[PDB]
């Protein structure tokens, strides 16, 4: 154990899992575009092997490159942002049925989003275009690399 | 050192770099769709840390899940395939200018492709749609997770 899972740096590789994922038609944290979410998601650091449940993380103490995460408040819900260098790659668990994000034809890099109630309940959101993997519940697995902080 | 970089298994995470990459309008190994290629690419196993220059691998000796890779011959050129669970995520090196693959609106998962001449020269190809990052030369970095063998 060298760097905590809470401490993030540019170039980190993250392996997320969203069991029993549901489909949200519009997500405010990404500017009103569809997303997949699970309330029992888990974040894996592939290189170091550390892991943590998303609902078990106090997200106001999470830092990226030495600084606190970028957070946005939408209709009384707090959303924390974990930017990535590139797009978030996700697929249905156990199958080769892959998904795609809202900016499938765009240079913009994707970013993980977390809702947290201040206690022990938290969601994890990933950008999607439609129900390409179904309406839910469905197990999905995501892979991405952590990128620099938003400007 | 437990498993060689030549040995691959489902769930492995690969960090590829395609320095001074060029743009190919049509790639046969992917059914005549554009690709990016570099002749000095490097394959990095993120979890185990092992790395190898793509030109330094005898690709006929590479195995995935205990079996040899799927290879195709197009106009006398041999292409080796490394399937991935999901799409290949790549971006320009040092920037947030991300790219997208040819099947951006498709469930189909992506797969890395390598050309090898039987000696010490080899290329690495990634699926793309257009010159979203330029015509080349340009440094790009790709991230993906190794998937099951083709059926």
């Amino acid at each position, epitope marked *: *154990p*060298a*760097r905590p899972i809470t*401490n993030w*740096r*540019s*170039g980190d590789v993250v392996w997320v899992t969203l069991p029993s994922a549901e489909y949200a038609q519009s997500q405010s944290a990404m500017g009103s575009h569809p997303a997949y979410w699970s309330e029992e998601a888990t974040i894996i650091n592939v*290189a*170091t092997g550390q892991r943590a449940a998303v609902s078990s993380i106090k997200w106001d103490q999470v*830092t990226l*490159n*030495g*600084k606190a995460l970028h957070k946005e408040t939408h209709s009384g819900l707090v959303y924390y942002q974990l930017p990535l*260098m590139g797009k978030i790659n996700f697929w249905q668990q156990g199958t080769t049925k892959a998904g795609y994000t809202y900016n499938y034809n765009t240079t913009d890099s994707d970013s993980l989003w977390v809702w947290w109630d201040g206690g022990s309940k938290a969601y994890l959101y990933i950008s999607t275009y439609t129900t390409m993997l179904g309406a839910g519940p469905v197990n999905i697995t995501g892979l991405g690399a952590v990128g620099p902080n938003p400007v | 050192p437990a498993r060689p970089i030549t040995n691959w298994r489902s769930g492995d995470v690969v*960090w590829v*770099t395609l320095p001074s990459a060029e743009y190919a309008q049509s790639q046969s190994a992917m059914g005549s769709h554009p690709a990016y290629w570099s002749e000095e690419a490097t394959i*990095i196993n*993120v979890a*185990t*840390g*092992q*790395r190898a220059a793509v030109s330094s691998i005898k690709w006929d000796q590479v195995t995935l899940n205990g079996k040899a890779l799927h290879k195709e011959t197009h106009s006398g050129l041999v292409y080796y395939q490394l399937p991935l669970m999901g799409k290949i995520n790549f971006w320009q*090196q*040092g920037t947030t200018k991300a790219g997208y693959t040819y099947n951006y609106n498709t469930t189909d998962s992506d797969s890395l492709w390598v050309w090898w001449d039987g000696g010490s020269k080899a290329y690495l190809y990634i699926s793309t749609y257009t010159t979203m990052l330029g015509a080349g030369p340009v440094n790009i*970095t790709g991230l993906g997770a190794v998937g099951p063998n083709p059926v």
Partner: antibody
Amino acid sequence: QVQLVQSGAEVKKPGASVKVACKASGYNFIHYYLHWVRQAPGQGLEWMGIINPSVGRTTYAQKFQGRVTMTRDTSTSTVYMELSSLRSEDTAVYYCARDVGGMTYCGDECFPPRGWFDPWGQGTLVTV
Amino acid sequence: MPQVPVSLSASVGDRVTITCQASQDIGNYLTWSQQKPGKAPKLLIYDASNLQTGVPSRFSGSGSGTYFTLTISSLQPEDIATYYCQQYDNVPITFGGGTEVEI
């Protein structure tokens, strides 16, 4: 358990090569960068250079430009330091410290390598 | 990275503030370490303010960008040492200069 152990203290004459090793155990040797820091008995800490234990790249200091070479051994998880001219002012405790944050697989995308010094070595004293 | 206080002596139980100044913007890529006469320097906080696990809660960091500071709420006798601020922003790692604290 993460720990770095260094070789024993040495005494050298003016003009000689001193090779100091720093064994690594408890983690992935090739994943983390390593540094070398000198400590004169009265003065403060002087950073000397950095090493990539996966490819062997080095980045030395201007003062220690023509006199310092750093090497690694993946098989035994050890990093080496050598000082060549070795004048009397090179009497210091030499430290190996594991660097964190950027972990040698990003490459140049995270090589302003940012991370505090996870375990320092025990130290090795060299007297000229 | 000059350390403005070079040597400060304060009564047991007082508050100690030690400041570091950088030549350029660093962000939170600075750490505070404590060194006893014969030992390797021990790590107090990861970044500008991030306490190491196992270090008493007396030690607390602050500052960002260029001006950094180290605070100690109580001055128990175990505090007789030297403290250093070192940046890990740019390729040449540099250290502070040290403060000798007495009781």
